[PDB]
Amino acid sequence: ETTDGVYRVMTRGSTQVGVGVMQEGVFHTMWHVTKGAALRSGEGRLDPYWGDVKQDLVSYCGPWKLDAAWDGLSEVQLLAVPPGERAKNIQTLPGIFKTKDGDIGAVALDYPAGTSGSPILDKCGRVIGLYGNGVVIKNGSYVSAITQGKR
Amino acid sequence: VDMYIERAGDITWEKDAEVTGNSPRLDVALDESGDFSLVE
Numbered sequence A: 001e002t003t004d005g006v007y008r009v010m011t012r013g014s015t016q017v018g019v020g021v022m023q024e025g026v027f028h029t030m031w032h033v034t035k036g037a038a039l040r041s042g043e044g045r046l047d048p049y050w051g052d053v054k055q056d057l058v059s060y061c062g063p064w065k066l067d068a069a070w071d072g073l074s075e076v077q078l079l080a081v082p083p084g085e086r087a088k089n090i091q092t093l094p095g096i097f098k099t100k101d102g103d104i105g106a107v108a109l110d111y112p113a114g115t116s117g118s119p120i121l122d123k124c125g126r127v128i129g130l131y132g133n134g135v136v137i138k139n140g141s142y143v144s145a146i147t148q149g150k151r
Numbered sequence B: 001v002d003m004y005i006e007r008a009g010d011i012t013w014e015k016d017a018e019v020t021g022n023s024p025r026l027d028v029a030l031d032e033s034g035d036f037s038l039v040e
């Protein structure tokens, strides 16, 4: 099925390669998680619809639906779904990726590779982007862009 | 290869949650392959 919620993306013993969001009948994840491969959901199959390697995003069953934006000001929550661990909310004040094409909110939180695609939320529970495309800074820790698509 | 999904939870904000992490302001570049790097 395609019931709303957050999902693990698994491969098969089974390995968690990522996470994604089901909203409005569309599954949203990061391109590097699935490379656009079809996804089994119960007895059904979800096919890729749209994606962009540069944004590192892919949607299944329809166009990208997530359009909430970080307000540049407020704290957010990473709904982290790490491999082998229950989903947990982590609240943080984003930093900023300053790029030649504008600023992007960015969260300084470090999780295993298979946490990629975990949603980042605003105070209303809307998904303002997905975790897992980022940089490593001098001390070894990680900063993820808040990666959001266009609806 | 069987790639499949399994539900892990409801998408909701948690009241009185753990507030952690810093807020770095970083100069960054993004290449056409989707890789971020730091501007040095």
Ligand SMILES: N=C(N)N[C@@H]1CCCCNC(=O)[C@H](CCCCN)NC(=O)[C@H](Cc2ccc3ccccc3c2)NC(=O)Cc2cccc(c2)CNC(=O)[C@@H](CC2CCCCC2)NC1=O
Pocket (backbone or CB within 6 Å): A032, A056, A110, A111, A112, A113, A114, A115, A116, A131, A132, A133, A134, A135, A136, A137, A140, A141, A142, B033, B034, B035, B036, B037, B038
């Ligand atoms: N390295 C640290 N601290 N944290 C990472 C967090 C991973 C979060 C999910 N995202 C990804 O897997 C993407 C995939 C690829 C998307 C590509 N478009 N990836 C990344 O963005 C980065 C990209 C990158 C790499 C090197 C850079 C150097 C300079 C500037 C920018 C850079 C950007 N790719 C990596 O980070 C790969 C990497 C590099 C070096 C070492 C490791 C992994 C080994 N680290 C890990 O095994 C876990 C360690 C634990 C897990 C939870 C407990 C604390 C941290 N962390 C980690 O794996």
